[PDB]
Design an enzyme around this catalytic site. Structure first.
Site, PDB file in Angstrom:
ATOM      1  N   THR C   1       0.861  -1.207   0.000  1.00  0.00           N
ATOM      2  CA  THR C   1       0.000   0.000   0.000  1.00  0.00           C
ATOM      3  C   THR C   1       0.888   1.245   0.000  1.00  0.00           C
ATOM      4  O   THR C   1       1.752   1.339   0.865  1.00  0.00           O
ATOM      5  CB  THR C   1      -0.894   0.006   1.243  1.00  0.00           C
ATOM      6  OG1 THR C   1      -1.765  -1.125   1.230  1.00  0.00           O
ATOM      7  CG2 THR C   1      -1.712   1.270   1.353  1.00  0.00           C
ATOM      8  N   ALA C  49      -7.029  -3.567   5.646  1.00  0.00           N
ATOM      9  CA  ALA C  49      -8.115  -3.016   4.800  1.00  0.00           C
ATOM     10  C   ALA C  49      -9.397  -2.866   5.625  1.00  0.00           C
ATOM     11  O   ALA C  49     -10.032  -1.798   5.542  1.00  0.00           O
ATOM     12  CB  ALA C  49      -8.341  -3.905   3.603  1.00  0.00           C
TER      13      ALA C  49
END
Ligand SMILES: *C(=O)CCCCCCCCCCCCC
Ligand SMILES: *C(=O)CCCCCCCCCCCCC
Ligand SMILES: [Cl-]
Ligand SMILES: [Mg+2]
Ligand SMILES: [Mg+2]
Ligand SMILES: [Mg+2]
Ligand SMILES: [Mg+2]
EC number: 3.4.25.1
Lengths: 230, 195, 212, 196, 226, 204, 222, 125, 195, 196
Positions: C1, C49
């Protein structure tokens, strides 16, 4: 979390045209010690259901008391307790399945594999499995422990899919179950020769057979086997 | 040790290597040189476990110097890099492997080309336009990918390395006490004494 | 990420990637890592997430309740601290979120808060968060000024994610751009890295190590 | 595994079950755990099948080479060769072996070699997992200088009880009779010994 | 892996499945698990695939040299003894579990070998993940004085039990029949009950669908004359 | 930590009508960090092609080792090694390191010069041989490659059709793996011509 | 030690069409190397034109589906028989999953149906409740085999128009329900070949404005 | 004990002759006649079974030996030397070839391996 | 965080605190103020585990500010230090202890004396002429042992602090990005903006 | 520990040794492992002394309170109270208990409660470490409806063999006879039972 102490081995079962057959040997093992030789592991509930239980025997006796209590509770303020509002296999299974999953979720499971064999009000065959994880599945043939590995292959040669059930008679089905119990006695080190068998037929009702023995065993060929090679 | 960088430009290879030697909680030396001249036109910078780094570098140096005398001939950077990779590839399956990562910056006098080889302690060799070992690459490769030009001159390349040192000095937690910069070209090896 | 945010004269630029992974498996390249709390509040998402999505949507509910009760837009300071105080209660439980809260109010101006599952809450001008944060930092720190045009600032943010998308194996998919001003945030499109890379390489003359 | 050896007037008898188990699965239900190292020297193998098989093969080789040079070995000699392998390799072996042999001079002899690699000469020996359940029975029922028929009954009854309580023991009861008359193999099937 | 061995009147028949799997993934849809030690001594392997192939080749090689040295056809007990003493030496680390069968001047023989070096004698044997499914069939249908046709049927049915009810086993049934005073007949893909059905769609692409950067001829030929 | 997935990368091989195709990605990394986009994993010794995935130091070492062995083979035999023979040599070479293995996933591809028969083979790290008719897959995205090959592949594809199939199999598998991609190479091999094509793919 | 989790294998596939959605899943249920059932339904009609499947640990899968079906029932009671929209169902399932954040449901969850504009919708959830609307998603054992094939054959990834050579992409033309069912069947046939936990049967639930229809196909039983 | 003959027993004489090789060839000259003929579709090797005694079963003594399924050997000279060479020739065909390439060696390479063993007996200690 | 120093001179207390905030391999900030004003004449610097440091400092700050309003009176530095120690002494036997080390620099307006208190996360309080937390003391205490004079002026005190920071910048491996210096005296708290 | 209970014509008999061991040391050589929960309901305690003592005391309390309200409890009731404690607290207990009691209606009854907390009604039960050695002997020698003298001999012989082979079992053989006649305590010393 525990460990199973006194244990029961394979429970095997299959559907046939008019109902279900279930069987389980009468042994309570204590590790490698074949301790208790008179343990009933098929427990009938009314005249339309048999619950076959493997794994920890102390947890089995607890489940046996829950089912006994379930019958008592159902009868309370129930004029149709022996008719339209009698306990169904589907009701008994779903209750156990709930308890098994609730107990695994508290990290304190009932260390068992259970098969609920019975016939519903409408004459439909009921056969479903549940275990200490709360995992449930249905099949024309169901078996626990060693039965899953050795019995299922033999029973599936009789009823391989749903369409084979109406073609299978009670005589062919029972023959297959009794043969599977012999094969398990040959190969399972924690099985006994003595077993119980239960038939739940939509016409003839519940037939509970006790003190059955594995017979017609092949051992004669052992005499010819000499040494481990040379 | 910590940060070692390499960049191959038009006509030269530039190796930058931290001068800080830190043992435990104290910085013992701020003037360390983490490089050895293998041959007149081949330089090898190194970083890894204490002792192993210098022991390995000097062992390689001795072997190449022995080859140079025997044949009265300088091995190509490609040949030296292949020799070094085999030693590390041999080392990784030893009783106690060499825990050493190296950059080999050489100028091939035959092909008239600078060559930069990055080899880790496993014996993983890659020829690159610019390379790094340890956490250096994480900060510097984004700058190099963005500003690298194959036709860059040594002075342009030196300026580009300055950007990399500043980014490392800004964002790295460890004080690596600046870098010693060395240029490898057709005329041999020389040190940039002001950086 | 890989996610970033930086402050300049034009306002706040927020650029995130779109790749989510489970191990070495690429779960999705369509993932949205920017959360629109309200017209002037944006939240970046890094780490777990579930933890980021769940708690940053919850933050939006707390910010809405604040401005219902106080008849006034919540400050970026107050909004960021609601999230940091919440994750601090769960400290040790294994929450894995690293986020940026980017917003503009009259009293604060453009503000960015780095909020962290360890309970770290930092105000700052530039932040890069995620596995590819180091790659994005390289481009930002060498090209950042206060006097950037909204156009140039947007490109720098886009280019910094592309730099990380290339090198960081756990970053990529596409680039989502946001521009936060005195009158709220403005979405500046989804940019596929598969097309953006070849476009930037050709036009910019960068990435001469790759062959195209 | 349930194995035993009993000395009687006419010689010695070796008794064993036929069950070999992997976990709770029965790998072989008709195993032969009575093995020949010499014409009138046999052994009972308990523990790792691989280890006991490997050891027995080496001894049979040693006694074959002994015979070629020095003539027929004593049962004591055979037990000493087993012991030497079991004792010197105690760290790497899991083998409990009962050595039983018939000389004309010494008659029936039984040597038990437990895990350690120690040797114990006994009038009778019981070994394997099943043995633990028949220490009480065998001690109470064993007599010295029994007849062949009495010793066969003693082993048959003892093993049947061991088989009954031990999950790891089962199948057929194999027996090997060692006397001056020669070598006789006996087998007894579940239907016979279960009803005792 | 679901391999079986069955003895019959005049010889021994061994059968095996054709599925090779790495983890849960099927690497080889039609792997041949029947190896030849010698012309009339065949074995099927389970466990570590590399070890089973490698150990068979080594003993099969040494059996051939031994056969030439002694001017005699090789014996199953020789293959059995050489395999078990090799495996025992390596303390189970060579993950080879085999069913060894064959005919020789002594007669027809059927053995099983485990990785630790333990061996078994039997009229019917089964080995592998599906051995329990196979052994169930063998224990149900096996009898003394089987004919060649009955033994092949029983052996293949035992493999099928493994193919269907065990995830580890699948695809096809390989068989090898070793009869006394006859050439061993290797029946590769004896049964094929797992042919894939025709796909709904053809995934043949239009030419030029893939984007190309560079083309070049690769020089595979040697350095040329003139 | 797991040696087979430090550097990353993939190799796929397919058979067609009188042709074989072998393809690989170009990525070499240090876990998350991308290091090189020119690390080719396909080598050739005469007309026999070998693709090697796994730990990059072993990929390089084995290439140098098989070059060494095929060169001596040729001097003594006075002919180039064939795919079937080379496959046995790879297996032998890998298994001799049984208890200290090379952390690689080799793939042999080529056409027998005498019979003209297309040949592919795959191996595990300790040298167990996988001789498939259709296709062989190897590397970090082997699961993805299996799924692509199993659906896309059909037998007896023409060289230029086979190119499209293997290219789409590699590209789409690599795009679902973090440690694969950064460019790709496809070898189309016929009995006496070999074409090498570099593919354009997303560089993330 | 008691391990409260298990793996029941299986594989599921959701594809969103232009005015329809399909949620497919194999009917095989397993533990280790044994088949429990060749026909154990995995994809369920939950009412309000929503189909759901929680693939992985079947006990947690059944528990979640049961609790969601319950949530639909109480949504009707509490909000005057209002239809639960697919987006609202998706957010509700996030809270069910995240509710057990520190003792998760070991399942990959996919729901399919129509959005409030009547277009095909598929939502995909991780075990701890992170969700995202998707055009295409395979879940479970053989997800790694199927997803790359769907990237190629549904979204036309790495495909370009002949003659242009990499310049012009293949245009993203919409797929009919007949075209999607072909790709689903070929996905599961391919998955069955190379994955041991996939086979026996394929059950597809097709969602349109007309309601929920079912289709069953045989898979290989080895 | 120990083999203390670590020096060559075959050495060059002033004339440049290797005496022991010449004397070995003289032993071959005394040996029974064997021959080989190559055809287009095959090769034939033949020799006389010179029986040492009529009581001796000459079938048990094989002068013509299979080395590989496609290679055969015959000799002239000292039978015992031939017998041990066939043993080594058969083994080297496996160890130095078949266990590497999974196929039997071509005639010329097996010949090369046999030749090497005979050369080493000409130079070794 | 990393380095926090304190020195009590004639008429004031001086607290020096590093500006670096490093998470993992990246320095996220180089201008962090690791201090809170508890009351007009009491300052507390802090260093320890991320989150806990600020959470603890602000919690103490709120409690002292609440006391100040309730009594319309500023607590003595001694009283504040005793309150802080008890909170940490309570904390160490909690489910999850505060992992925070603090220096409390205060000017007692009643006694007209500067006071420096060093308290670690266990609740170990000591009044000192000069103190430090973490690895800072290992380098700096030898210098302070040598050059510290109780009657030295604030200007003299700042130089001695510069000599401490110079030694840390030379011998410490971590780049702590300089220090923010704050003086606590009779007139209250002020920051030295050039250091 | 070697404990057992046998049912006979006139009622039931409880048999136990007197050895309590810490490691290989004998802490007490004259222990009483036969304990009273009611006038004609006794139990045999095996496993942790602390756990078995604690459990027995609770049951004696429950049956005393049962008696005050509902009169004399059945042996089955007493076994159910033991089971409830052993089963519900199975994680924290190490107790193998044999419950033996005499009713006038039911006569002699024996219930064994192993580690799990399961209940098994049996004609006779054997428990503790020593039991393992006398499964063979007890199975072969037990008959139903024995006399008092036969049952005393059966327990005396069985325990003597268990005592002989078990290091953890020894001292005196204590016995408690439960019949309509009342409660009789018996003791048998080493010099008596060792020579059997
Ligand atoms: C089949 O897919 C491979 C099975 C081979 C198992 C042996 C692998 C040996 C690995 C060595 C362990 C050392 C790791 C650091
Ligand atoms: C994306 O990264 C999702 C990660 C989901 C993790 C699921 C964990 C399931 C097993 C956890 C075991 C907990 C034991 C109490
Ligand atoms: Cl006590
Ligand atoms: Mg990337
Ligand atoms: Mg199968
Ligand atoms: Mg202190
Ligand atoms: Mg004693």
């Amino acid at each position: 979390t525990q460990q199973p102490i006194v244990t029961g081995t394979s429970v095997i079962s299959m559907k046939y045209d008019n109902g279900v057959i279930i069987a389980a040997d009468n042994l309570g093992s204590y590790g490698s010690l074949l301790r208790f030789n008179g343990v009933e592991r098929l427990i009938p509930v009314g005249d339309n259901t048999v619950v076959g239980i493997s794994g920890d025997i102390s947890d089995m006796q607890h489940i046996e008391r829950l089912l006994k209590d379930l019958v008592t509770e159902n009868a309370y303020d129930n004029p149709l307790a022996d008719a339209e509002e009698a306990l169904e296999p589907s009701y008994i299974f779903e209750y156990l399945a709930t308890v098994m999953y609730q107990r695994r979720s508290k990290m304190n499971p009932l260390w068992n594999a259970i098969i609920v064999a019975g016939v519903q009000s409408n004459g439909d065959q009921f056969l479903r499995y549940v275990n200490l994880l709360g995992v449930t599945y249905s099949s024309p043939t169901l078996a626990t422990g060693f039965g899953a590995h050795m019995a299922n292959p033999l029973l599936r040669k009789v009823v391989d899919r749903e369409s084979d059930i109406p073609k299978t008679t009670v005589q062919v089905a029972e023959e297959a179950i009794v043969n599977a119990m012999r094969v398990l006695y040959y190969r399972d080190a924690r099985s006994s020769r003595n077993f119980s068998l239960a038939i739940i037929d939509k016409n003839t009702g519940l037939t509970f057979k006790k003190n059955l023995q594995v017979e017609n065993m092949k051992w004669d060929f052992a005499k010819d086997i000499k040494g481990y090679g040379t | 040790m910590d940060i070692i960088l390499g960049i191959r430009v038009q006509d030269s290879v530039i190796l930058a290597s931290s001068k800080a030697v830190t043992r435990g909680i104290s910085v013992l030396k701020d003037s360390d040189d983490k490089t050895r001249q293998l041959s007149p036109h081949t330089l090898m910078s190194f970083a890894g476990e204490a002792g192993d780094t210098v022991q390995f570098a000097e062992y390689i140096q001795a072997n190449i110097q022995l080859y140079s005398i025997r044949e009265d001939y300088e091995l190509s950077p490609q040949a030296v890099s292949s020799f070094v990779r085999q030693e590390l590839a041999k080392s990784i399956r030893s009783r106690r492997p060499y825990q050493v990562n190296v950059l080999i910056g050489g100028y091939d006098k035959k092909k008239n080309k600078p060559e930069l080889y990055q080899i880790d302690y496993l014996g993983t060799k890659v020829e690159l336009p610019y390379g790094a070992h340890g956490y250096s690459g994480f900060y510097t490769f984004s700058l190099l990918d963005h500003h690298y030009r194959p036709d860059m001159t040594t002075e342009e390349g030196l300026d580009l390395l300055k950007l990399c040192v500043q980014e490392l000095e800004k964002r790295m937690p460890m004080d690596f006490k600046g870098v010693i910069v060395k240029i490898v070209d057709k005329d041999g090896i020389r040190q940039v004494d002001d950086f | 990420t890989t996610t970033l945010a930086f402050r300049f004269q034009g306002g706040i630029i927020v650029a995130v990637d779109s790749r989510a992974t489970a191990g070495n498996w690429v779960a999705s390249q369509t993932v949205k890592k920017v959360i629109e709390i309200n017209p002037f509040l944006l939240g970046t998402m890094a780490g777990g997430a579930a933890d980021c999505q769940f708690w940053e949507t919850w933050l939006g509910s707390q910010c809405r309740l604040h401005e219902l009760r106080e008849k006034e837009r919540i400050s970026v300071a107050a909004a960021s601290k609601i999230l940091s105080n919440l994750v601090y209660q769960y400290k040790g439980a294994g929450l894995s979120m690293g986020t940026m809260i980017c917003g503009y109010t009259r009293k604060e101006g453009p503000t960015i808060y780095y909020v962290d599952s360890d309970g770290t809450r930092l105000k700052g001008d530039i932040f890069c968060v995620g596995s590819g944060q180091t790659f994005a930092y390289g481009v930002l720190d060498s090209n950042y000024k206060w006097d950037l045009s909204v156009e140039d600032a947007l490109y720098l943010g886009k280019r910094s994610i592309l730099a990380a998308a290339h090198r960081d194996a756990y970053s990529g998919g596409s680039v989502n751009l946001y521009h936060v001003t005195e009158d709220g945030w403005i979405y500046h499109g989804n940019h596929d890295v598969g097309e953006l890379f070849w476009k930037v390489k050709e036009e910019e003359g960068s990435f001469n190590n790759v062959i195209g | 595994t349930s194995i035993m050896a009993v000395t009687f007037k006419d010689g010695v008898i070796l008794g064993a079950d036929s069950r070999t188990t992997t976990g709770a699965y029965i790998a072989n239900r008709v195993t032969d755990k009575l093995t020949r190292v010499h014409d009138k020297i046999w052994c009972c193998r308990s523990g790792s099948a691989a280890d006991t098989q490997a050891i027995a093969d080496i001894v049979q080789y040693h006694l074959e080479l002994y015979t070629s040079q020095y003539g027929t070995p004593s049962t004591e000699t055979a037990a000493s060769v087993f012991k030497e392998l079991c004792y010197e390799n105690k760290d790497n072996l899991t083998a409990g072996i009962i050595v039983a042999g018939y000389d004309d001079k010494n008659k029936g002899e039984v040597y038990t070699i437990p895990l350690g690699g120690s040797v114990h000469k006994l009038p009778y020996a019981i070994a394997g997992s099943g043995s633990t359940f028949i220490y009480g029975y065998c001690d109470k029922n064993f007599r010295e200088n029994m007849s062949k028929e009495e010793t066969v009954d003693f082993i048959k009854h003892s093993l049947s009880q061991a088989i009954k309580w031990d999950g790891s023991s089962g199948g057929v009861i194999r027996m090997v009779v060692l006397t001056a008359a020669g070598v006789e193999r006996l087998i007894f099937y579940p239907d016979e010994y279960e009803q005792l | 892996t679901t391999i079986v061995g069955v003895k019959f009147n005049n010889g021994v028949v061994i059968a095996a499945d054709t599925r090779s799997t790495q983890g849960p993934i099927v690497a080889d849809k039609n792997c041949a698990k029947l190896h030849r030690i010698s012309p009339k001594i065949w074995c099927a392997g389970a466990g570590t695939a590399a070890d089973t192939e490698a150990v068979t080749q080594l003993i099969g090689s040494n059996i051939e040299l031994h056969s030439l040295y002694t001017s005699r056809e090789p014996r199953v007990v020789s293959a059995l003894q050489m395999l078990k003493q090799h495996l025992f030496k390596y303390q189970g680390h060579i993950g080879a579990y085999l069913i060894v069968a064959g005919v020789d001047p002594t007669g027809s023989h059927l053995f099983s070998i485990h990785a630790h070096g333990s061996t078994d004698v039997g009229y019917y044997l089964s080995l592998g993940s599906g051995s329990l499914a196979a052994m169930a069939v063998l224990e149900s249908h096996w009898k003394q004085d089987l004919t060649k046709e009955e033994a092949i049927k029983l052996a293949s049915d035992a493999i099928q039990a493994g193919i269907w009810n065990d995830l580890g086993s699948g695809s096809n049934v390989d068989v090898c029949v070793m009869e006394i005073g006859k050439d061993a007949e290797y029946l590769r893909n004896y049964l094929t009950p797992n042919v894939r059905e025709e796909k709904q769609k053809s995934y043949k692409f239009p030419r030029g669908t893939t984007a190309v950067l560079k083309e070049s001829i690769v020089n595979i030929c040697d350095i040329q004359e003139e | 930590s797991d040696p087979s997935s430090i550097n990353g990368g993939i190799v796929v091989a397919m058979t067609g009508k009188d042709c074989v195709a072998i393809a690989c990605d170009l990525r070499l990394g240090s876990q998350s960090l991308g290091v090189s986009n020119k690390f080719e994993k396909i080598f050739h010794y005469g007309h026999v092609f070998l693709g090697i995935t796994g730990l990059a130091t072993d990929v390089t070492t084995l290439n140098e080792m098989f070059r060494y062995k095929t060169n001596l083979y040729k001097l003594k035999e006075e002919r180039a090694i064939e795919p079937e023979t080379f496959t046995q040599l790879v297996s032998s070479s890998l298994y001799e390191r049984r208890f200290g293995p090379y952390f690689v996933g080799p793939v042999v591809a080529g056409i027998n010069s005498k019979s003209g028969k297309p040949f592919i083979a795959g191996f595990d790290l300790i040298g167990c041989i996988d001789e498939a008719k259709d296709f062989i897959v190897s590397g970090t995205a082997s699961d993805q490659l299996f799924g692509m090959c199993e659906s896309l592949y059909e037998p007896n594809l023409e060289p230029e059709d086979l190119f499209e199939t293997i290219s789409q199999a590699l590209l789409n598998a690599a795009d679902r793996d973090a440690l694969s991609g950064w460019g790709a190479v496809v070898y189309i091999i016929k009995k006496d011509e070999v074409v090498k094509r570099y593919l354009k793919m997303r560089q993330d | 030690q008691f391990n409260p989790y298990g793996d029941n294998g299986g594989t599921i596939l959701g594809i969103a069409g232009e005015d329809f959605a399909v949620l497919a899943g194999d009917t095989r249920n397993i533990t280790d190397y044994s088949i429990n059932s060749r026909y154990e339904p995995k994809v369920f009609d939950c009412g309000d034109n929503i189909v759901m499947s929680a693939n992985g640990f079947a006990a947690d899968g059944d528990a979640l589906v049961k609790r969601f079906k319950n949530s639909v029932k109480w949504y009707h009671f509490d909000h005057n028989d209002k239809k639960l929209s697919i987006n609202s169902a998706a957010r509700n399932i996030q809270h069910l999953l995240y509710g057990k954040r520190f003792f998760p449901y070991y399942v990959h969850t996919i729901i399919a149906g129509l959005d409030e504009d009547g277009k095909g919708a598929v939502y995909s959830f991780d075990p701890v409740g992170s969700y995202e609307r998707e055009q295409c998603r395979a879940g479970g054992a053989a997800a790694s085999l199927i997803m790359p094939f769907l990237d190629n054959q549904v979204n036309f990834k790495n495909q370009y128009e002949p003659g242009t050579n990499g310049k012009v992409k293949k245009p993203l033309k919409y797929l009919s329900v007949e075209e999607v069912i072909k790709l689903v069947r070929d996905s599961f046939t391919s998955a069955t070949e190379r994955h041991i936990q996939v086979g026996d049967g394929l059950e597809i639930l097709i969602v349109t404005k007309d309601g929920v229809r079912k289709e069953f196909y045989e898979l290989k039983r080895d | 004990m120990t083999d203390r003959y670590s020096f060559s027993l075959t050495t060059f004489s002033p004339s440049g002759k290797l005496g022991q090789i010449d004397y070995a060839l003289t032993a071959v000259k005394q040996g029974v006649t064997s021959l080989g003929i190559k055809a287009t579709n095959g090769v034939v090797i033949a020799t006389e079974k010179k029986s040492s005694s009529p009581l001796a079963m000459s079938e048990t003594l094989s002068k013509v030996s299979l080395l590989t399924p496609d290679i055969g050997a015959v000799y002239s000279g000292m039978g015992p030397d031939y017998r041990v060479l066939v043993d080594k020739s058969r083994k080297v065909a496996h160890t130095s070839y078949k266990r590497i390439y999974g196929e039997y060696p071509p005639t010329k390479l097996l010949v090369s391996e046999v030749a090497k063993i005979m050369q080493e007996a000409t130079q070794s200690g």
